[PDB]
Amino acid sequence: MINAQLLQSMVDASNDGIVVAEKEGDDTILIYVNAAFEYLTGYSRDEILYQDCRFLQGDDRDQLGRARIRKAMAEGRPCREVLRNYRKDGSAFWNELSITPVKSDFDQRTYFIGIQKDVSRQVELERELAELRA
Amino acid sequence: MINAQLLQSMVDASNDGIVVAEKEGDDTILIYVNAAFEYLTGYSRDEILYQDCRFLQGDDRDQLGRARIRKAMAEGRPCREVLRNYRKDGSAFWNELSITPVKSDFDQRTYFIGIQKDVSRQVELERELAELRA
Ligand SMILES: Cc1cc2nc3c(=O)[nH]c(=O)nc-3n(C[C@H](O)[C@H](O)[C@H](O)COP(=O)(O)O)c2cc1C
Numbered sequence: 041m042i043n044a045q046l047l048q049s050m051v052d053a054s055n056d057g058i059v060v061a062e063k064e065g066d067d068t069i070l071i072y073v074n075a076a077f078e079y080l081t082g083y084s085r086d087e088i089l090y091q092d093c094r095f096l097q098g099d100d101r102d103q104l105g106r107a108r109i110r111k112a113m114a115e116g117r118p119c120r121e122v123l124r125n126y127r128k129d130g131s132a133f134w135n136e137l138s139i140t141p142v143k144s145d146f147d148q149r150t151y152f153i154g155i156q157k158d159v160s161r162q163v164e165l166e167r168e169l170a171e172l173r174a
Numbered sequence: 175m176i177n178a179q180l181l182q183s184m185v186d187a188s189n190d191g192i193v194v195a196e197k198e199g200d201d202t203i204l205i206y207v208n209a210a211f212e213y214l215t216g217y218s219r220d221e222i223l224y225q226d227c228r229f230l231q232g233d234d235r236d237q238l239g240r241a242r243i244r245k246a247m248a249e250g251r252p253c254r255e256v257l258r259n260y261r262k263d264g265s266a267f268w269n270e271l272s273i274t275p276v277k278s279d280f281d282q283r284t285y286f287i288g289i290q291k292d293v294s295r296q297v298e299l300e301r302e303l304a305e306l307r308a
């Protein structure tokens with residue numbers, strides 16, 4: 041279709057937070073993040089890169105999304121889950137995570153492309169509708 | 175960060191619908207679409223590719239999203255808009271469109287990366303909350 045350099049620059053430049061990570065045992069290590077992801081998190085490419093993405097959950101580690109994500113990556117099937125995340129400045133938001141497993145098949149490595157959005161307003165709208173139905 | 179071939183395969187394989195298009199006057203022509211986009215629309219890469227993406231609106235051409243998208247692409251700034259779209263089988267859904275303008279700067283061409291999601295359930299939840307507030 042298009043040359044891969046063009047595509048990489050279209051991704052580098054996307055308004056959508058986009059990352060790639062590589063499975064290592066019980067971890068997945070971020071090898072690629074775009075600018076919009078740096079803007080979403082309030083971190084820098086260097087701060088972010090080369091660790092597992094969970095670091096954004098911070099203290100708040102009892103969240104059902106985790107298990108559903110973990111369950112889903114394990115089975116090798118895409119998921120979409122929203123977790124509470126925290127920026128560098130400490131502020132808190134609902135991050136929707138779209139995670140897709142990709143096995144290399146050239147080798148035994150598996151990768152994941154994430155695509156993430158601050159969903160905080162969409163959630164507030166639901167908490168409200170939930171209480172109206174009560 | 176990562177080699178561009180790896181990245182292109184992570185995109186090719188994403189569960190998220192991702193396209194790229196190229197500005198030509200009042201049009202933008204799709205030069206790249208991934209599999210998930212083919213699945214979103216119910217079209218095939220060959221059917222989809224090489225025309226302007228509006229073809230999915232079909233008959234339903236009076237939609238405010240259009241003007242906001244048009245206004246936004248013009249100004250050269252990202253937007254996120256949801257339009258009513260129609261698959262090949264005719265079925266209808268709410269498609270959220272995240273569109274990012276990218277100028278090449280090597281030449282005078284401008285491109286757009288879109289990232290699109292069936293948002294129909296999130297919308298139904300709002301129509302409901304809207305009427306509760308009435
Ligand atoms: C592609 C990809 C994107 C991810 N996005 C980040 C995210 O933006 N925020 C977050 O808190 N965790 C995110 N994670 C989730 C964690 O890295 C981790 O897989 C999850 O918390 C489940 O594993 P655990 O229970 O061992 O923590 C992402 C993971 C992957 C593979």
Ligand SMILES: Cc1cc2nc3c(=O)[nH]c(=O)nc-3n(C[C@H](O)[C@H](O)[C@H](O)COP(=O)(O)O)c2cc1C
Nearest residue numbers: 195202226227228230231240243244271286287288
């Ligand atoms: C990157 C990109 C992705 C787009 N996504 C498609 C979409 O999935 N659905 C749709 O109906 N139109 C989509 N469009 C919107 C139309 O192609 C068009 O630009 C919009 O309807 C406004 O222009 P117009 O008023 O001249 O029709 C997309 C456009 C771009 C540039």
